[PDB]
Amino acid sequence: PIVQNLQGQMVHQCISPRTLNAWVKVVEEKAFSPEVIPMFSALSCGATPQDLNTMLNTVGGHQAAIQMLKETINEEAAEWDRLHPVHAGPIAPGQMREPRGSDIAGTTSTLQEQIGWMTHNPPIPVGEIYKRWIILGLNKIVRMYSPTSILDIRQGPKEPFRDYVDRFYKTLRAEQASQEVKNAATETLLVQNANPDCKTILKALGPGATLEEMMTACQ
Amino acid sequence: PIVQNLQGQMVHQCISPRTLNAWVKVVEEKAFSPEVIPMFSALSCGATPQDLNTMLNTVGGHQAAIQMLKETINEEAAEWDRLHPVHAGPIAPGQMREPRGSDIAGTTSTLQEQIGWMTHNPPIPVGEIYKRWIILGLNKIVRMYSPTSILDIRQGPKEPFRDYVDRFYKTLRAEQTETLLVQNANPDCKTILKALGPGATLEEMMTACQG
Amino acid sequence: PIVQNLQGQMVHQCISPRTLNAWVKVVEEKAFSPEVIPMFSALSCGATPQDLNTMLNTVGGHQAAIQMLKETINEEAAEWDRLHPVHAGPIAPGQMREPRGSDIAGTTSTLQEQIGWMTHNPPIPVGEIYKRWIILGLNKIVRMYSPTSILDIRQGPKEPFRDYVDRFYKTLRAEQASQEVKNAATETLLVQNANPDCKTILKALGPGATLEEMMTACQ
Amino acid sequence: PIVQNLQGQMVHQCISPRTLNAWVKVVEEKAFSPEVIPMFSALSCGATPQDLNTMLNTVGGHQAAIQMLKETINEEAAEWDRLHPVHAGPIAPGQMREPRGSDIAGTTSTLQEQIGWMTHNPPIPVGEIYKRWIILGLNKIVRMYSPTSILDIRQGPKEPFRDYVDRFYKTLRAEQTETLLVQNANPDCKTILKALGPGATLEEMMTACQG
Amino acid sequence: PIVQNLQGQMVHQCISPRTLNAWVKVVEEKAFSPEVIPMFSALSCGATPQDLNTMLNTVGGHQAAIQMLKETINEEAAEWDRLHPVHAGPIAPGQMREPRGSDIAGTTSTLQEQIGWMTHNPPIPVGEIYKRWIILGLNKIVRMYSPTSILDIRQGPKEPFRDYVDRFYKTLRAEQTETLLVQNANPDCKTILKALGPGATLEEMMTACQG
Amino acid sequence: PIVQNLQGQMVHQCISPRTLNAWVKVVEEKAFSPEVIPMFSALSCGATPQDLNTMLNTVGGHQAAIQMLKETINEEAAEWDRLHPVHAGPIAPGQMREPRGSDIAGTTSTLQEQIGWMTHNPPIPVGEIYKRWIILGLNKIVRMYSPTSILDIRQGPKEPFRDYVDRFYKTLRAEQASQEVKNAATETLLVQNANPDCKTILKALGPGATLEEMMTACQ
Ligand SMILES: [Cl-]
Ligand SMILES: [Cl-]
Ligand SMILES: [Cl-]
Ligand SMILES: [Cl-]
Ligand SMILES: [Cl-]
Ligand SMILES: [Cl-]
Ligand SMILES: [Cl-]
Ligand SMILES: [Cl-]
Ligand SMILES: [Cl-]
Ligand SMILES: [Cl-]
Ligand SMILES: [Cl-]
Ligand SMILES: [Cl-]
Ligand SMILES: [Cl-]
Ligand SMILES: [Cl-]
Ligand SMILES: [Cl-]
Ligand SMILES: [Cl-]
Ligand SMILES: [Cl-]
Ligand SMILES: [Cl-]
Ligand SMILES: [Cl-]
Ligand SMILES: [Cl-]
Ligand SMILES: [Cl-]
């Protein structure tokens, strides 16, 4: 990654064995559960495009997801090229060439070039741009590998309401939807799919009851 | 987090894999036992709002608690907005816009903005403000997930007094006293404690009922 | 904790995950064996009152001991208030308010105030003062939870003298007594409670025999 | 490795026990699966030729692969010598002799010489040149140790399409496409994929054959 | 310990949780086998007397050995006092009082005083002096806890000579030679070693009795 | 070890618990397999003679090898004394006494003296000289403890050629021979000791076939 030294300068640092192992292990243990994505984002904090490719390439197996990831990356890279055409011309001494989509993705750019873009003033955050593409692709993989639909999450006749809300928002989280969609799904299904006894208790709370009040009422 | 380097400047530093793993593991092993909250506070020392959201988002499962957390955060964010109305106007050079509730919560603010507020002179500690909201929400989760009432913690007829006080104050901590303790002791220890008189310390009470 | 940087200044540093885990694990594995106290002291090296409260609060269970700990802290805090009454008046720019007992204990003082006291010239070591109170309370807990009295430590007819001395000073250590009391208990019980065969050998060594000579004689 | 300190100078640093153990363990657990190579590249970040030889030499067993590695290294070293003839002559003050192939490979060069080439202005990155040769040799080992041909990867009659694509591109990675994928799908999924038309993404193909 | 920072000044640093755990674990697993002493010396590198007392005090059990350690420390402390009589008088600015034996042992000296002696010019290495006393006491414990005499280490009639030399010098290290080795070899290897003549190296002796 | 700070000066640093544990564990798990030697060299990077003695002394058991190690060290130390006689005379202020063989081995030299030799300009690398002696002794131990001769490595009638080459060069590596000897042993035994079917295939490849071609041919 690119870290700041004690001279105020942003300096490249080697990816650590702790970071490499942590990412490999979380993929082995959790596959593509929704919480793997924020773990990837945090483990790739300050990462260069080279570091991001390293984390993706160190993953063994799951090559169907990795190949889908590469397709999303190429779609986003092509869009960047459509929006930012490179202007031919010799590069100035203190300047850097404008990055292509494949340069942001680390496939046609060197580490030195990525350091140059990231440590420029103003910086071109090719690592954060690339990470935005990878997470976009990881969101589709999580959504695709989600086994259960939110419509099929219904509270059992003897299931505690706490456990049913756990399954509800776990299934809802694997959708990788916006907060507006999450709130629309909550107002459409959480109360309506509760079991008969708890549903009656929740209807009498009104639409303005908080989840804390809802879980308390069906305790 | 935002840490001081070895020269004296407040500099952003990436959250470490050790910190990420420690928080994930303590939630996996302890869920939301009361001691998880001080662990969260210490692991999030100097954290930015982004770091706090990272720690919350890396938790798998417990999504009912996570959703309650988000509601408490939104309640506190709305209160901050009611108390700190935003003053429209262009931000001066070297200055920063006043943060909204959603800015403190890291949802409408960039990392650079959070670093700017935290490293300002005087600083606006959006990380500590956000952490205060999260811990407030985590306290509600602990109380809700507390299985036992303090009224049902009674010393067994042959239970050592030390073990009963352990269960008493463990239950009491989750439910978030000194005379209720004597009331729920067993008959034999209750008689000994009555003969101690008011003002006995817990050390003196436990000594008297050693058996 | 408060650590020194390379500018000669004492600077606050976040408590590390290694320190947090080490303290939690030693309490889980060793409870309140006597050697837990020096482990607590070392793990809390340079700790602020906030760090000390963090270590105590991260402990799950053992709440009877924790509650006794808080009582000892309050007794020591009240004594500090009796000995150091706070003088009302506005605080100077480069100065700090005098700490109360609850300020040393971290309950009515902020982290910034604790850093200010600890990094002052001369420093007010609220962390070391608080640690002195906690260890005082931990000493009472270890003494209370000690299962065996030193009077009941007697050498078996076929027990090796080495193992009996191990049990003797393990029991004696859980008393948390001064070295004078340890020496008084040694001169009163170690030889007198040895088994018949070894006791006769030790009597013929005289009161001036070292433990090395005593253990050698009954080998 | 050669790392930049916290002042800006490129300084040699000892290879860490964490790095040594990580490389030994990944070879023990994964042998020469394709993902071992990017792990080697990352663990050898900034490595000198001495560090690269250290990592290779700490591997126990797999000596047939290690011996193939040495042959590939010697082939690349000889090519470097053919392309960069050494110019005889005394080296000037503050200058360094041009490295031979065996110097890049760390066998005829001292650590000081490798540090000098890597920290020169302009630098001669003998570590990155050497690493390029090693990875070239590691690629040959992966290809040789690949057990299955892509022609033999066919979807089972009741095998989930997701698992078949996993095996397809795992085999394809070791053998180091989009229409071969459809050809080797089972009859039921093949009919669905034919009806998708050319230009379907892998996401669309996997969605269609979800079953 | 007292370590040099990255600018050149000797600065006190807290003993690390890694060091504390490593010392506790090696005592738990190895007790007082001879190799524990060099482990103690290395783990206590640059240690102050306070750090040395911390490491000794974190040991659970083995209190008979710990009590022998304290007696040896007191014997060495008394000798230091006999050799270095304290000169009464007020300490000058920027100066330090001469340490007593109990000051070197960390029992009557503060951490600041130990840092002052160790960082003085010239330094008084109370940590290294104290460590010398502890290792002297640890050597007595190893000798006392050594179970086997070198006289009872004899090669079995069918025991490999390599394993017998292992036991010989392991016992010899705990008891803290080259002809005793030949004397306690079995008849078959003894005849081979007699025919080697005096002056044979251990390598030559082990080669001759390879069997 | 001796590490460089951020002042350009070579400064002594304490051996780390990670390094101490790693060396002890690799000896426990791998004994004197050939790959233990490069692990020792890397773990002792920048080590002083004191650090090298620490690593050797922390090893429990294997005292026959340790005692052979000490004999090789003494032979190399005596040779150094024969080649570098010490010139008597008072040492200058900014100078250091010339090291003896026992000084390089850390037995008659202090840590400060070893730091002085290693950080001098020009430096006297007593750590690298001592490490050269230890590795020389470790090479003899590995060679002595090797169970199998290269002459007895023959391919089984149904053994894959890949596995036979593994055993060949594992046995050959435990000889600790020069690359010339390794190439001479390869040209003398690898093809000649292959099984009948693979041997005929390899003879038809010619002496100029690479190992990659040889392993491919007998796949
Ligand atoms: Cl690391
Ligand atoms: Cl995986
Ligand atoms: Cl994310
Ligand atoms: Cl790859
Ligand atoms: Cl880490
Ligand atoms: Cl808290
Ligand atoms: Cl998320
Ligand atoms: Cl840590
Ligand atoms: Cl516990
Ligand atoms: Cl203590
Ligand atoms: Cl708490
Ligand atoms: Cl390390
Ligand atoms: Cl690669
Ligand atoms: Cl080697
Ligand atoms: Cl640590
Ligand atoms: Cl030692
Ligand atoms: Cl103690
Ligand atoms: Cl360490
Ligand atoms: Cl061993
Ligand atoms: Cl080597
Ligand atoms: Cl030793």
Residue F58: its chain E contacts at CB < 8 A? 35, 38-39, 42
Resolution, expressed in angstroms to one decimal: 2.3
CB distance E52 to E69 below 8 Å: no
How far apart CA C37 and CA C42 sit, in angstroms, is 9
Q: F11: helix, coil or strand? A: strand
Residue of E nearest to C41 (CA): E54
Q: Which secondary structure element, helix H or strand E, spans residue B66, and what is its range?
A: helix B63-83
Test C67 with B202 for CB contact under 8 angstroms.
yes
For residue A14, give the nearest of D1, D30, D169 by CB distance.
D1
How far apart CA B76 and CA B79 sit, in angstroms, is 5
Question: For chain C, which chains pass the contact test of at least 3 CB pairs under 8 Å?
Answer: B, E
Distances (CA, A) of C139 to A146, C34, C191: 54, 8, 27
For residue A187, what is the DSSP state?
A: I
Residue of F nearest to E37 (CA): F58
- First-last CA distance in chain B: 51
What string of DSSP letters covers A134-182? HHHHHHHHHHHH--S-GGG----TT--HHHHHHHHHHHHHTTT--HHHH
C12 touches chain B (CB under 8 A): yes
How far apart CA C166 and CA C190 sit, in angstroms, is 11
Test E71 with C212 for CB contact under 8 angstroms.
yes
Question: How does strand D2-4 pair with strand C10-12?
Answer: unpaired
How far apart CA C109 and CA C37 sit, in angstroms, is 25
E4 touches chain F (CB under 8 A): yes
Test C16 with E13 for CB contact under 8 angstroms.
no
Question: How does strand E10-12 pair with strand E2-4?
Answer: antiparallel
Q: B176: helix, coil or strand? A: coil
Distance B199 CA to ligand 21 centre (A): 59
Q: Which secondary structure element, helix H or strand E, spans residue E67, and what is its range?
A: helix E63-83
For residue C189, what is the DSSP state?
A: I
CB distance C48 to C111 below 8 Å: yes
Which residues fall within 8 angstroms of residue A76, CB to CB, at 6 or more apart?
A101, A132, A133, A136
How far apart CA E102 and CA E76 sit, in angstroms, is 10
Question: How does strand B10-12 pair with strand B2-4?
Answer: antiparallel
Side chain identity at C194, as an amino acid letter?
A
How far apart CA D182 and CA D154 sit, in angstroms, is 10
Distance B38 CA to ligand 6 centre (A): 4
CB distance F2 to F127 below 8 Å: yes
Distance C217 CA to ligand 20 centre (A): 50
Q: How many CA atoms lie within 13 A of C28 on its CB side?
A: 9
- First-last CA distance in chain A: 48
Test A60 with D35 for CB contact under 8 angstroms.
yes
How far apart CA C29 and CA C25 sit, in angstroms, is 6
C-alpha closest to that of E125 among E114, E133, E134: E114
For residue B158, what is the DSSP state?
A: T
Test D35 with A20 for CB contact under 8 angstroms.
no
Q: For chain F, give percent helix, strand, coil, nearest 5.
A: 60, 5, 40
Helices (H), C31-160: 36-43, 49-57, 63-83, 101-104, 111-118, 126-145
E18 touches chain F (CB under 8 A): yes
How far apart CA E30 and CA E62 sit, in angstroms, is 12
Return the exposure string of A97-120: e unless at least 16 CB atoms fall within 10 Å of the residue's CB, then b: bebbbbbbbbeebeeebbbbbbbe
For residue C7, give the nearest of B8, B46, B202 by CB distance.
B8
Residue of A nearest to B53 (CA): A38
Which residues have CB atoms below 5 A from the ion given as ligand 19?
F 27-28, 61
Residue C175: its chain E contacts at CB < 8 A? none
Residue C145: its chain B contacts at CB < 8 A? 162
CB distance D64 to F211 below 8 Å: yes
What does CATH list as the number for F2-145? 1.10.375.10
Interface test with C, best of E14, E68, E72 (most C CBs within 10 A): E14
CB distance F103 to F109 below 8 Å: yes
C-alpha closest to that of E136 among E54, E52, E14, E62: E52
Write down the residue that tokens 């392993």 correspond to.
F215
Phi-psi category of residue A15: left, alpha or beta, with phi > 0 → left and psi -120 to 50 → alpha: beta
C111 touches chain E (CB under 8 A): no
Residue A211: its chain B contacts at CB < 8 A? 64, 67-68, 71
Distance B105 CA to ligand 21 centre (A): 58
Distance A179 CA to ligand 7 centre (A): 11
Give C203→chain B minimum CA distance, Å. 38
Side chain identity at C142, as an amino acid letter?
V
Compute the Cα dihedral for F127, F128, F129, F135 and give only its sign: positive
Give D112→chain A minimum CA distance, Å. 21
Write down the residue that tokens 């640890």 correspond to.
E138
Interface test with C, best of E13, E27, E32, E63 (most C CBs within 10 A): E63
Give C56→chain E minimum CA distance, Å. 17
Give D50→chain A minimum CA distance, Å. 18
Give residue D69's Cα distance to chain centre.
Answer: 12
Q: D127: helix, coil or strand? A: helix
How far apart CA D85 and CA D103 sit, in angstroms, is 13
For residue F17, give the nearest of E6, E18, E169 by CB distance.
E18
CB distance B49 to B121 below 8 Å: no
D21 touches chain F (CB under 8 A): yes
- First-last CA distance in chain E: 51
Which residues fall within 8 angstroms of residue C163, CB to CB, at 6 or more apart?
none
E46 burial (CB, 10 Å; 0-12 / 13-18 / 19+) is buried
Count of residues making up chain A: 219
Distance B14 CA to ligand 5 centre (A): 10
Ligand closest to Cα of A39 equals 3
Return the exposure string of C38-71: e unless at least 16 CB atoms fall within 10 Å of the residue's CB, then b: bbbbbbbbbbbbbbbbbbbbbbbbbbbbbbbbbe
Q: Which secondary structure element, helix H or strand E, spans residue F10, and what is its range?
A: strand F10-12
How far apart CA C67 and CA D67 sit, in angstroms, is 66
Question: For chain B, which chains pass the contact test of at least 3 CB pairs under 8 Å?
Answer: A, C
Distance B132 CA to ligand 6 centre (A): 9
How far apart CA D158 and CA D151 sit, in angstroms, is 19
How far apart CA E196 and CA C132 sit, in angstroms, is 68
Q: Which secondary structure element, helix H or strand E, spans residue A185, and what is its range?
A: helix A179-185
Q: A10: helix, coil or strand? A: strand
How far apart CA C74 and CA A154 sit, in angstroms, is 52
Distances (CA, A) of B16 to A18, A52, B51: 9, 16, 10
The structure tokens listed for E62 are 């083995």
Cα pseudo-dihedral C58, C61, C64, C66, rounded to 10: -10
Give residue B115's Cα distance to chain centre.
Answer: 23
The structure tokens listed for F6 are 């951020």
For residue F4, what is the DSSP state?
A: E
D12 touches chain F (CB under 8 A): yes
Test C63 with B206 for CB contact under 8 angstroms.
no
How far apart CA D211 and CA B177 sit, in angstroms, is 61
Helix/strand/coil (H/E/C) assignment for every residue in D152-185: HCCCCCCCCHHHHHHHHHHHHHHHCCHHHHHHCC
Residue A39: its chain B contacts at CB < 8 A? 20, 24, 58
Give residue D133's Cα distance to chain centre.
Answer: 9
Give A114→chain D minimum CA distance, Å. 15
Side chain identity at D124, as an amino acid letter?
I
D203 touches chain A (CB under 8 A): yes
Side chain identity at B96, as an amino acid letter?
M
Test C211 with E144 for CB contact under 8 angstroms.
no
The structure tokens listed for B26 are 């303590």
Spell out where E141-206 has E strands.
none
Q: For chain C, give percent helix, strand, coil, nearest 5.
A: 60, 5, 40
Distances (CA, A) of E135 to E37, E44, E60, E131, E176: 7, 11, 19, 6, 13
Q: Kindly report the number of other CB atoms within 10 A of residue C148's CB atom.
A: 11
Which residues fall within 8 angstroms of residue B195, CB to CB, at 6 or more apart?
none
Residue of D nearest to F26 (CA): D21
Residue D6: its chain F contacts at CB < 8 A? 6
Residue D159: its chain A contacts at CB < 8 A? none
How far apart CA A143 and CA D11 sit, in angstroms, is 46
Q: B110: helix, coil or strand? A: coil
Cα pseudo-dihedral E23, E25, E31, E35, rounded to 10: -60
Test C165 with E64 for CB contact under 8 angstroms.
yes
CB distance F137 to F80 below 8 Å: no
For residue F5, give the nearest of E7, E18, E202 by CB distance.
E7
Q: For chain A, give percent helix, strand, coil, nearest 5.
A: 60, 5, 40
Phi-psi category of residue E49: left, alpha or beta, with phi > 0 → left and psi -120 to 50 → alpha: alpha
Ligand closest to Cα of F56 equals 21
For residue E64, give the nearest of C33, C166, C210 by CB distance.
C166
Test D1 with A20 for CB contact under 8 angstroms.
no
For residue C3, what is the DSSP state?
A: E
Residue E41: its chain F contacts at CB < 8 A? 54
Give E160→chain C minimum CA distance, Å. 33
Backbone phi and psi for residue C159, each to the nearest 5 degrees, phi listed first: -85, 130
